[PDB]
Design a protein around this ligand. Structure first.
Ligand code: HEM
Lengths: 497, 497, 497, 497
């Protein structure tokens, strides 16, 4: 059998010639017998004094923690990021100090709308989260398999998610909600085009590209700042599953990606992703035709070529899934000195949203979980006691700042980069911005004709379930993109009805 | 479209001629605009003073509560239990006072091992939970679609569940774990025979029978006690899905049962289950050939015929799924006067396990959730303040007992029934009890030959993935049941290898 | 006895001629006996099947929720705010529509550093929180008994609190921490002067003034905005306790304020506070000698006289303390249309800090607690399911925005007021701002000589326990305020040593 | 100053010649500046992108965990238990293997009814909790400073506590509740006599005796079982504070015991308690005049002399109070092989109550907190993933039992001791048992006349606040104890009125 199936046999083998450990309670007391309960005779009621049963039963009753609000179903791996090129002129980040520097990384693949225990081979954006354990703390590059997103405003993110998940009353998947939201927000036309293309159902997690998808700010030692876009493309080649084979695998192996990654790491074929950065200057950002901080826009390769940095190699499988994949927390606000946030509104929303949901799902002290600890760094601050504090609580060090007793002091060289922003402080409408140019370019320049037909057929097959007016609005947006797009989609919808 | 698909259209229609409500924050403040965020100019960073965004985003970040440890994926309905026969000679329960008495009931169907968002048409025991809102509080009849269970000792329940769920390291479904546990515990041979039969994959939730599966204690007004077994058989007839059609539906509609129930309730065809009780006396229990409190044993119909009581009709769909299906809590310890627990060890374990996991999953005050409240009863006790107390907290009533100020007093007519139990107080082994007689009876008396072939083929198709020695142990148990059973299973396994 | 002592006797009296209710479990089942447990004979072990005992015991085990991080020890009352003057030219807030409008209010008094169960008569800032139930949601005016605070930067608030609370290792009150922090941050010199004056230990909660202490933004219907400061002065007159009488009451009645308020409300003498506003224009704010948004600065009465608005009357005592005083949540971000936040950094920090700690302490759905609900308003949004959802969950209304089904729509008349802010976006130092002018004015203009002597004696009595260099730094700051201040403090410290 | 006051100075001194650590966020990123926030210019609003501020502020907002339901205010210390006598003939417990064996212990002193932050020198039972880190797990001896308790039935424990704590409506201490409960339950007459005696207010935690107060079961290697009572008397001598000095210290130093213990451990005078056991045989238990498992009864020293075992020495102060004193969990169900529970109903209730409240207050995985871990033992079981799992989660070991892969196996030598119990299974009334004999013996044999006068004066001073009929019931119980007792109490009450 494949190495995934032989987990218990392997665990037994590498534990050969050793006697089985003593079965203990949570407090370390040896268990006399864990196959029968204390009763009043052979046919009597159970007793309270059976501490072993109630202990294990309560621990069983407290096994489930809340699943992630999005990206619940996922797989995990571990490896290293190795620097292969010198970008010190762009960023003073310790992760990019010198050539050959290897930084431990933890990676999680996920599906955005699937719940815990859903099918893996479904048409849905795949999330790629990387946690670098830099000497300057953890760096969480939490990207997607697509260089863009559906919306460009964080205030729309819950609603969008609510449309992608189940109906509030029937608890069923509703194409009506999906396409109503998508047709009322034309800024999705780009990502939908990426979603229903061939790369909407990648073949496993090793045959897909990764995209930080946000503009970031790289700061060098001399204090100059540039804008950046992190890419990391698969060295195993892009490979996608057909709709029919994906539908088959959904019932054959609903855990296709997890098994694929586990077997690829267990048979030695370590997957790898090569790391690139797109770089832009400030005057280039002020002269960009679109908003360079728009999440629905890309930077064309001809104007901004990819600059290699390093490669991402995943060589270790998780020992325990829950302790290392289900409990790992990725915070985009975790950026070491040299990397900073951009005026991208979506990145601004993510700076707040992630630690909040991490304190809800895992707990206030989730950064004490071994997978979330910056174990390759030194934590020292005035943050003190919380629920489930499993450290020294920083001992008897003073817990107020400033003090006069030699407690941790701020490092003035880690100051943020300053930029002057003008204009009034209010809510600026961005729904009426450009929504069709880059979509048209991707449609008539990147895709060939058979890929266009497959894209339109997928879109129509999904959209045929919505109401007639929602279909009309969606096809109107597609026609405003390009007449062939909406024309083919409308013809296929007419054939469906 | 079916009524399930037209949820939003119907909600819009029954709200015709009404203007849309005002969009408010959680605290009721009107929202000026919820489509853009407050930035420093059109391309500026987001501000903290955007209270609307952070409010809705934090509420979105705290949307997921822990799923049920078992029976996560489920559907819900509501209706009434109507008494049609007089069993007052057996139980003084107010739910069974007089003919024609209608008691509101809330029902939840579920799959034992599937997580939230898994396939609905899978081979797995289906759980049927009923909550009666009796004037004497809530009565939770939490049964299965099978009259028995896999094990007979609650101390084995977590382990069993751990074997039925994903591998701890690979997070994959492991037939190795399943069949290792099943072959090391022969007391499963009965329920496995029920699981891999035709009724292992019922066609929706309306074409399956329900079984409290436990022995209960019925007490009359005069104080005499009898043993009972609650059945409730479907009036829509037993109907099951073929393995191929179930595998197809798993990828076609992973929410098959939810949609089926919702449509059946929305088109007027209210499903119904007829309620029966098997009754046994105390001397009959002491002269039973097996343990009458064994969960893996049934009471034969020839010796204990079914006695009709009433019928269960489900007529209302949930308004909101989460508030009424995902948050509903079923506690087998919720028994009104007249119904009591039995020396059945599994019922004893369930008496403790359920409120614990309810306080973990929902919260200490989960009985304040409207679906969990005994709204048709009067709650008055000395239980006081906890997290999320949404009542008057019983006002300024004295919170200690006994007192001298007219606080709630105990009702001496609700005392439990007394029974003397002899024998020493220790752990009694029940793994070596009878495990094959009733299994053989079900195999050679209830099933015909083609059903036997289908049973063996299903068992072999699932077992073929385990190791060779696990297959040998399983087939040895099946052969000890009956030679034809293990013989056919071993032949099919040899064909598979 | 006083009405506070006769709570149970009164509850018994107003329940005369009524039989005691039935003692029930949490699920409404009648309890046969709650004075003995189920045992194996008279001297036997307890049984698991005793559901009543384990139910009440688990509810007892889940009685404590986390105390407030600050302002834990507190008292509560309820009443109405009555408008007596027309300020519609300043704010379009529905709470200030017309003369005679009565809005229900909930008020909580508290001590900032005392834990739950500490002495009430201690030298510490007293917090005054008011929750108005306006038709436009809840308005939380969460002020102090002092018009200023110790610091002016929210990033210093945890540290300050950490210095005011117990030592991290010894768990003792440490004057060393207090005075080290206060001497390293001279911007406290003002509030310390208010803290160690006569009004540092008010006589109960009815003899103290209330101060929102922040600059707010009042917006009229025509769109013009002004800056505001909310005052509300006691109609019972300012009255303070001597140090010796306060020390006596600390051991006599550690719940002095709670009892005082309860008795004053129960004997009919309803306390009242008269509401004033200080108003400032935008050019006045740009020509203010100090920072008008500095929390350590006041607006002089000669340049900005108080403008009466209404009065605050407290007429109802809480029925249950925990359900109405311990679970009430005050969010400064709860501002109806017409009231908005100011560039005051401390108000900006409070806009975020309070809902976070409310979701931690009470739960994600704390706005469903009856005391926290905007019951005089209509809640309608797309915020959905969370832990402990005790509502309809807004039924089957669509949960995404925008939609096409008549769900709640944004009210464009509730838009925020726009202001253009210039300058770069970075951290601006405000520790070196003016720290002694208003302190000197309060010292040599408001206080007389005996009050100055009492202030210096209190400061010295508290400071004498710190180290010598901390005393030197504190007295240096006091001398930089005014030579007499530091001179008297240093003389008293020399006398103490 | 005393060593408690010089905590920060000492921390600075033992860290001399070392530069201050780098101030980091929770994720290890260096903080550029933690004294100012990011604003839009010098007088601009705060930004969301200020991750440092929101991080530390959220961690500050999640600082409070629920206080203990009882025994909230407490102090902690650490040391060793050294065996000095051979009791192997009584118990096979590894803690009592051989002479000179030193086992690490963690000790917590507490006050039963005081909340966190209340006065330490108050009349209230003092709790003494010891956690032994035996090679066979942790042993939690959780006793009091009194050999008995107020009640004898666990179903009365919440109510009692509710009477000892604040009124539900006024949130004030109510002598009415206290004495109503005490007069309605005469079985308190003994412990009340201990409570209002001289030892009701011990002088610190080093001048009080400790009592497990329960009957336990000692089992030897040969399988014979005896009944036991654990005593441990102070080697510093019994010393108590007068009522006036206690009232003074309540306002002088509300943390008297914490400071006393900290200074005694920091100046080298390590306190010590000598360990004794009272032993009883089974026939002696069946011939005892009272119930030997009654918690309100003692074993007379003449019939059951104390047998020395070892001594308890406390030599280490906690490094961080919260991580080692506030988060330490004591579970009476934690008993190593050789020590077992007794038919004492109160011990049966405590076997369940403590892990439940520990999972509520600390979390499901509270046994992973370093102070709660059995670090001197090996934990190996099938208990798996829960909220806040900070271990390997036992790696990829099989999580079901029984299995065929060498996972931890039960140790059949740790089986419990079997005893046959007769009689019916119901609730047996024990309120009408003997309540005055041992009380009379303590009154007229142990106390002298001046101690009797002080006892009566304390009882009257506390009881004078209750209603007249409650006073009559209390004095009636005291008179039924002995005529002089109730006579003096009634005379003092008449003088008070
Ligand atoms: C940066 C500045 C401040 C921050 C971050 C802050 C934070 C907090 C927090 C976390 C609480 C706990 C509330 C709860 O757990 O329910 C609280 C309570 C409170 N604060 Fe502040 N605070 C600040 C300054 C102030 C100011 C300036 C005032 C008054 C002018 C004030 C008055 C109060 C009051 C009265 C309460 C009690 C709330 C209640 O009783 O429900 N605080 N604050």
């Amino acid at each position: 059998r494949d190495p995934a199936s032989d987990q218990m046999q392997h665990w037994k083998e590498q534990r050969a010639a050793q006697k089985a450990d003593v079965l203990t309670t949570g407090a370390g007391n040896p268990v006399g017998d864990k196959l029968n309960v204390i009763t009043v005779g052979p046919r009597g009621p159970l007793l309270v004094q059976d501490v072993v049963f109630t202990d294990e039963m309560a621990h069983f009753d407290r096994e489930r923690i809340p699943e992630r609000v999005v990206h619940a179903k996922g797989a995990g791996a571990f490896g290293y990021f190795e620097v292969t090129h010198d970008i010190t002129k762009y960023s003073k980040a310790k992760v990019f100090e010198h050539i050959g520097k290897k930084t431990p990384i933890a990676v999680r693949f996920s599906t955005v709308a699937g719940e815990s225990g859903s099918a893996d081979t479904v048409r849905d954006p795949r999330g790629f989260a990387v946690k670098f354990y830099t000497e300057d703390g953890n760096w969480d590059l939490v990207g997607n398999n697509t260089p863009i997103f559906f919306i460009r405003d964080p205030i729309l993110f819950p609603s969008f998610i609510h449309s992608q998940k189940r109906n509030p009353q029937t608890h069923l998947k509703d194409p009506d909600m999906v396409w109503d939201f998508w047709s009322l927000r034309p800024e999705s036309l780009h990502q939908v085009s990426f979603l229903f293309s061939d790369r909407g159902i990648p073949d496993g997690h090793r045959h897909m590209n990764g995209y930080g998808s946000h503009t970031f700010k790289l700061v060098n030692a001399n204090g100059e700042a540039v804008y950046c876009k992190f890419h990391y493309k698969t060295d195993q080649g892009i490979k996608n599953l057909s709709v029919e084979d994906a539908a088959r695998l959904s019932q054959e192996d609903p855990d296709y990606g997890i098994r694929d990654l586990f077997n690829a790491i267990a048979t030695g074929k370590y997957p790898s992703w090569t790391f690139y950065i797109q770089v832009m200057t400030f005057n280039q950002a002020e002269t960009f035709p679109f908003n360079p901080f728009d999440l629905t826009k890309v930077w064309p390769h001809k104007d901004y070529p990819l600059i290699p940095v390093g490669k991402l190699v995943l060589n270790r499988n998780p020992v325990n899934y829950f302790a290392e994949v289900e409990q790992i927390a990725f915070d985009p606000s975790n950026m070491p000195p040299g990397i900073e946030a951009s005026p991208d509104k979506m990145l601004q929303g993510r700076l707040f949203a992630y630690p909040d949901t991490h304190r809800h799902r895992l707990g206030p002290n989730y950064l004490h979980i071994p997978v979330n600890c910056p174990y390759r760094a030194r934590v020292a601050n005035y943050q003190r006691d919380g629920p489930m504090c499993m450290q020294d609580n920083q001992g008897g060090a003073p817990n107020y700042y400033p003090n006069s007793f030699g407690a941790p002091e701020q490092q003035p060289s880690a100051l943020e980069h300053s930029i002057q922003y003008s204009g009034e402080v209010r809510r600026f409408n961005t729904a009426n911005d450009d929504n069709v140019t880059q979509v048209r370019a991707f449609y008539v320049n990147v895709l060939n004709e058979e890929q266009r037909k497959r894209l339109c057929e997928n879109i129509a097959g999904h959209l045929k379930d919505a109401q007639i007016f929602i279909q009309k609005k969606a096809v109107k947006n597609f026609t405003e993109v390009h007449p062939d797009y909406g024309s083919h989609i409308q013809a296929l919808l007419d054939k469906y009805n």
